[PDB]
Design a protein around this ligand. Structure first.
Ligand SMILES: Nc1ncnc2c1ncn2[C@@H]1O[C@H](COP(=O)(O)OP(=O)(O)O)[C@@H](O)[C@H]1O
Ligand SMILES: Nc1ncnc2c1ncn2[C@@H]1O[C@H](COP(=O)(O)OP(=O)(O)O)[C@@H](O)[C@H]1O
Ligand SMILES: Nc1ncnc2c1ncn2[C@@H]1O[C@H](COP(=O)(O)OP(=O)(O)O)[C@@H](O)[C@H]1O
Ligand SMILES: CC[C@@H](C)C(SC[C@H](N)C(=O)O)(c1ccccc1)c1ccccc1
Ligand SMILES: CC[C@@H](C)C(SC[C@H](N)C(=O)O)(c1ccccc1)c1ccccc1
Ligand SMILES: CC[C@@H](C)C(SC[C@H](N)C(=O)O)(c1ccccc1)c1ccccc1
Ligand SMILES: [Mg+2]
Ligand SMILES: [Mg+2]
Ligand SMILES: [Mg+2]
Lengths: 331, 324, 329
């Protein structure tokens, strides 16, 4: 089962518009193609075109990404599978906008109806809508860690100092798994507890950014939600499903974890014997998502601007080749 | 004939004066010498002294540079020769001031009379003065591209996005020439069309500085004027490249140094092809083009090592033969 | 042998803003520094170091002076060459320790100012100890800085702080060098001290304006030389000369003089035959006063904050490698 790769192009921002930026990206959602204009002033006709599993153009809204991509993934998680979605792309292209979102100003929407909310809050909101009172006895727990300079910080930890570090070990019970020693896993009892948790998480990250150089662009963010489901069959049997969803917002593609991820992906695509998972914190964490039994999706984010031609091409090639990686989703 | 090399030292700026900066540079126009005080507090007798084709001290005004250096060169160009002037030196020493200049404030002067105007505007002006007054039919075309990170941008292009990139290909009908694919070459019908053209180019550069890290200090700027003169007994074509190099303090600058060394040592394979700048400049160097270098320096003690680096770098270039 | 002490500064505003946790516990009595090393993963992990002395966040400037400098100033007065270094990451209190700071307004005189560091106190005390002692004596000072292996003279009459010194072997002293161009100012009485220091600090301020990350990369070498005369019953003279070098090193975080100094301390300490003095401007300058004949002290400054774990451990390992003291029980 191949890793699914989608592309999301953001709209122009104000600074690009003030610089009279030209578009070099055309997205065709129906053909699922992205075509980029590569020849600038010299060669008006040259393009590079790629087919992906889905393509989202500049007008795609947060809700569109959720309906197209996330909903199907979540339903699989609820069936008791493990799934991973990660965002890959240049700093400034919308990785964080996509994975987390933002709050619209003034207080003019609830967090659950905010059009700027991204994948994490919609996912948590939906977990509760989908399972609450639908018979399922169920629990939800969340964690949020960040990797920076191969050190591990805990955004949800009750410790008031964000710099207190985690430690990673192999998990003796799960052959591709790790244990994040010290990681705070918060039980979310109902959706009315969701916002405050995320909010405190974001406030610790804000502090971290004042502490460490180029923090948000160099950091990888790893959000995980685990759903324990217990049901009761008409026969009398008690049956337990456990689903886990990893939501990952990588460092800007433009560095050991980012570097090792590339080497890991390259080794998977070229079927080379040794896959260097152990050489970074990120790839140890993602081992099961990258040639394990976790179902993995990639969202490659790009800018439409001519200025960014080179990184836009690099992102598309990187993402396109990852469509060849096969996982064995199973639970 | 040898590549001509001159030196221009700028006056102290206000931050230097506030830092109580001492001069370590003495320029002697008559001996054509630059003498640098090198011993600091330790040895008051140490100097490095260099002889150049011309030396311009702190008090030199834009018009002196134009009259002394460019007038003779522009004569050559009008006679159908190709010429190239490039400024080399540390960021902050006056490479752009010299090649382009600046606008005095409050519209005090027309652009033709502005004391701060540099080589490019004075040249375009004088081309029209000299030839209009000549009688012969002539046309004038200009282009302005910049090299940043080995990418080529067109400052005069009608395209509204300065980031749209040019490409470079070998010129099939010239062994040392290149064609800049996409390059806007604007016909200048009258000197009253000059300022707006340069003005828009500069506005596009301003946008570019905004988009790319340390743009103006790392960019090389290539301004070219071409004059077609209909003579009988004929078309005479004169081309003048006016080049404002990246700060000397990076593939193109790197390769230029290697090219210059290879030309100095008289080695076989000058690596012109290993950077955009040297491919563009190939024909200039060890081509028929007559080349002048204007080496720019600061007078301040603080900048000692870079000042010596510039002087040494430029001085050796005097031994290179043009061949035009 | 080398004396090694550790000084931990107090939390600063930004660290409190960011709710910083301490990972450093200092015990002056036991001369121990205990570092909390396990963050979130292991609450019980601790690394413990033992030094000649340990000063905690509350330690006053004058106490650092009394306990560290005085014994050393006595040796100098007896005509020997001594050096005191401050070592540690930028921001931990090296310059605070070596020079101190000037309390706002003028609530105290420089001699009384509780923020004054080792340099001003040392000068003040030299005159006290010798001015009521008897003896005829002479005091001169120099303050130079090493930046990118370039040498700048902070007390020089030259108005341009960028005029560079040069360094040569002292033909009459194989372990010494001549700092060509160096301004040695005679300080006649204590009422001349402050303006000299103040002119030097003003030169440095200008330098930091000229050169990238100047104060964090520079080594600062302040030198006091004392000439002391005594006549014999027959009118012959015997001068004894003492020298004190107060050295505020470049930040240890993550240049050439810095690594060389390390190799020289390492070589002096594990006692290797050839000491690498020649290799840097800093160790050539200080060779005279190093070797073990004379008292040498390193004040390793650290931060208490969790954020700085790795650099604090690194500073501590450095200090520990300079004089290995074993933990007690
Ligand atoms: N799809 C989008 N629609 C509108 N604005 C976007 C979109 N994606 C990103 N942005 C905006 O672009 C800027 C950078 O996005 P961000 O999420 O920080 O990117 P990254 O995480 O890749 O650095 C932010 O101001 C964000 O609001
Ligand atoms: N010959 C000169 N006379 C007066 N001012 C000058 C001179 N050369 C340079 N300057 C000033 O010095 C500063 C830096 O000049 P600039 O041309 O930007 O140097 P560079 O292009 O070599 O970085 C500018 O403010 C400019 O006005
Ligand atoms: N022991 C201390 N007590 C109070 N403040 C201190 C102490 N040590 C350092 N500081 C403060 O920390 C900051 C940095 O100290 P500084 O001497 O500049 O460190 P360094 O020279 O090692 O970079 C200054 O604001 C200083 O006042
Ligand atoms: C205050 C808005 C927070 C709570 C945010 S966006 C955080 C932003 N991307 C940042 O980097 O600070 C969120 C949560 C729900 C709805 C909208 C936004 C959020 C979403 C996921 C995880 C943490 C915060
Ligand atoms: C507004 C003054 C422009 C038109 C300038 S100076 C541009 C400046 N060095 C910059 O980097 O922006 C000029 C043109 C004529 C007379 C004086 C200045 C000019 C000179 C040569 C090429 C382009 C601009
Ligand atoms: C105005 C206070 C000066 C004179 C200072 S502290 C300089 C400060 N550390 C800096 O880096 O600028 C000093 C001198 C005496 C008493 C208190 C401070 C001093 C101490 C030693 C050497 C030079 C200055
Ligand atoms: Mg981001
Ligand atoms: Mg310039
Ligand atoms: Mg300091």
């Amino acid at each position: 089962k191949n890793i699914q790769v989608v592309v999301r192009c953001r709209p122009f921002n104000l600074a690009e518009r003030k610089a009279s930026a030209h578009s070099i990206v055309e997205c065709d959602p129906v053909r699922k193609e992205v075509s980029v204009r590569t020849g600038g002033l010299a060669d008006k006709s040259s393009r590079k075109t790629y087919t992906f599993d889905m393509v989202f153009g500049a007008s795609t809204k947060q809700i569109d990404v959720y309906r197209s991509v996330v909903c199907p993934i979540l339903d699989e998680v609820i069936m008791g599978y493990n799934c991973t979605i990660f965002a890959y792309g240049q700093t400034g292209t919308g990785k964080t906008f996509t994975m987390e979102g933002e709050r619209s100003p003034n207080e003019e929407y609830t967090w659950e109806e905010d059009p700027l909310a991204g994948i994490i809050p919609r996912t948590l909101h939906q977990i509760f809508e989908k399972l609450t009172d639908n018979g399922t006895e169920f629990s939800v727990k969340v964690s949020l860690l960040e990797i920076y300079n191969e050190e591990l910080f805990d955004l949800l930890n009750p410790s008031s100092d964000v710099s207190e570090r985690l430690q990673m070990f192999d998990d003796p019970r799960n052959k591709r798994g790790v244990i994040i020693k010290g990681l705070e896993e918060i039980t979310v009892h109902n959706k009315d507890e969701v916002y405050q948790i995320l909010e405190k998480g974001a406030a610790k990250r804000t502090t971290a950014a004042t502490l460490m150089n180029a923090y948000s662009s160099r950091s990888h963010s790893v959000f995980s939600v685990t759903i324990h489901m217990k049901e009761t069959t008409i026969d009398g049997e008690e049956l337990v499903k456990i689903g886990k969803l990893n939501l990952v917002d990588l460092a800007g593609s433009e560095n050991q974890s980012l570097l090792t991820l590339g080497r890991v992906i390259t080794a998977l695509v070229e079927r080379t014997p040794h896959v260097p998972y152990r050489e970074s914190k990120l790839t140890r964490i993602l081992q099961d998502s990258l040639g394990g039994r976790t179902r993995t999706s990639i969202i490659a984010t790009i800018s439409p601007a001519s200025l960014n031609l080179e990184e836009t091409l690099s992102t598309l090639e990187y993402a396109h080749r990852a469509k060849n990686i096969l996982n064995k989703p199973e639970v």
